[model samples]
Target: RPEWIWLALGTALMGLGTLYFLVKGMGVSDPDAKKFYAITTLVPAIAFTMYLSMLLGYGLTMVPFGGEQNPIYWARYADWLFTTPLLLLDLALLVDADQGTILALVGADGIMIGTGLVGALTKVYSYRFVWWAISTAAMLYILYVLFFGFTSKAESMRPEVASTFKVLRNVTVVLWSAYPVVWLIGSEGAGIVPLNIETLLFMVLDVSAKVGFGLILLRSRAIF
Candidate 1:
């Protein structure tokens, strides 16, 4: 049950991040910048609740895996479903992406996370692989949009804004790419990684993705 310890670590980190973002956002002056801070603040706030739920063992479920049932933290997906779109919103808004492009990216992200859930839940190896493929495809599509779809628009902004967007975009792209890799190696796929390691790695990634991204965005002078 060492995963319990990792869960505790995750919960504590997320809780601290939630407070950090909230406090960091309190001094903002510009309305648009304030909205950005609000978003940055909410990401960790939502993660805090989900991580706490996982730590308390309230949001977990057993899923079939490798001829055995493994405990799956379904709450993690719930957190992603709610927060990932907001992350995209933050990026999209920065580039001044049209509503349709933003919505499309968010929709594709939903498919990515949702199919990941389905893949994780499936018992059959082949079926699980199929869902994983589908989910990964959606992830690739999202990355494509983030990398190519927004480049022109992002570059068109103020120099500081463009540079900031590039940095944030790279942060998101790199962090998100690890998710599927984790799934493939962790208990959900090949079971090559143990539960505790899986939990710990995810905790690190979550903190980096939500808290780290928020810190960078909120602290950027371009946004303000």
Candidate 2:
């Protein structure tokens, strides 16, 4: 009932805002702003494409392909064709790059690659920075899981490590779920201050605590 109430309120507010935007003759600014607006407009499309690819991967991996496996292979090949080049470009940027620049460029390349994949597959445009943020968060979370939860022997042996990883996983799930909520609310013309609050809180707690501190600790190790 509470969930239904929240959904109803959100939907009603969004409808009202959409009507207002449509009636006000509110046009976005000149060429550059228009371009940005156009690109941002495709966020849903980009998210959809990524979701589709993930679904495809899941379906192929889980379901039996039988004799009709070539299509799956071809689809995967196409995915690689688009994603691989962008990955290489990121690698090129990383070589001889400073740490901050490398992180930024990697983030940029993630945006470019994600949008490229979505555009190539669905013919939809996407904003670079939005994709960048999404991609960076995904990569960071994946790395954290692999390193701290999966790879670390201490995680298996130590209760503290196990608990920490459990918390990390829960936090990642919460943050990921929040993304779609923020996107949906923003689409409905809701003020993004609440979303920003979540972002800031997560950045300080999750990003700074898990990712920043992890990187610092890794760098301090003599091998790094």
Candidate 3:
């Protein structure tokens, strides 16, 4: 049950993503499009560092779950705090979402991730559930904004841009939804799943969410 094994793999995969995006979009001529390099590249770059910290044992904090102390890699929440907003921004900017929409979405995302961190750290079951409920509410709000606020904006864009946004949006919703579920079932929540399995699951989800999403966005003609 060496969780560091998955953590190291996650670090390597995220590092690969950072390096790939850094080089892949370098030649774009539009000043506006050039920002994608910064946005897309930074997401995985941050995840790269977060994973490396966890791999090196610098990212873990033990929280009591049942009779056992479970390792909660708070760095994961740290990574999400920085990157989820950027991920939303990537879509928001693509659709030319208004500044207010961007701010509201990012604010909700911050609350979601922030409450999630406190919830993870809380040892008392009742308090933990309270924080978790608050976090979940914020996430639900985020989804509502994504579906309702962003769609009309995306529809106003070119067809290709709208289609790309749809794909990215759906993928984001699916992958992001899985995180809370994983948290619920893993040692962090009900303790139904083993620690190493939870680690591997999160590694897969993170790689897909950041790296996979980045590749799709970078490859889309809408970006160029």
Candidate 4:
């Protein structure tokens, strides 16, 4: 019941905020507005952070509720610790904070490191320069975290005390899901289109937006 109330509020806020920003910043008149509507790029990272924070608090505080010496508690806590920060950093990029952005960059580094380690062991991408680059990035992130550390003041203020992380975690989820709900029906006509046509359309859209246009835009702007 409590979680439901929190969830509802989070969803409502994220939805309202997104709409307000999109309309104010880009406007409905902008033909390309819809293309920037994707929540995938940054939302998942924030959700991951929130999830981890809440889990950490829940595991530590709810230990008595579940039982002493419970293996489940430790397992859940460990899982949260390892994965949540990476997610948080990724999602933080959509917002104003530079710290979150840096975290996200570092998180990517970690992923590359893992991929490189795998490649090295398997001798798959070992000779590929890309794998080497990934390994380098991973090392960089590890070093950054080791020296700088990451902080979340908002999470620290959670009422659940231990559940602070959980509270903030739902913010992105609510926003990401809410935005699509309002306009999802607009694409209904696409469902009636032939499978081949649809596939072709998807390919065109993806390539034009993600690969072709995206690369151009990235190069044109100073991403860093």
lDDT of each: 0.88, 0.34, 0.89, 0.34
Q: Model 1, stretches more than 4 Å misplaced? A: none
Q: Candidate 3: how many backbone clashes? A: 0
CA RMSD for every model? 1.0, 17.8, 1.1, 20.1
Summed backbone clashes in each candidate are 0, 0, 0, 8
Stretches of candidate 4 off by over 4 Å are 28-224
lDDT of 4 by residue, 85-187 (tens): 4444422432323665565655665575355433323322224335545555554564344324322432333333223222223432333232122211111
- Score candidate 3 by TM-score against the native: 0.96
Model 4 global lDDT (CA atoms, 0 to 1)? 0.34
Of 1 and 2, the candidate ranking higher by TM-score: 1
Compute the lDDT of residue 67 as modeled in candidate 2. 22
lDDT tens digits by residue: candidate 2, 1-224? 11223323333433343343333213643443333233222322232243244333431221112222111111322432333233223222212224554455445445544543332222112342354346546555544533443435334435644444444345444544443344323211122444234323322332333233223222221111
Per-model TM values vs. the true structure: 0.97, 0.25, 0.96, 0.24
lDDT of 3 by residue, 99-124 (tens): 98888899999999999999999988
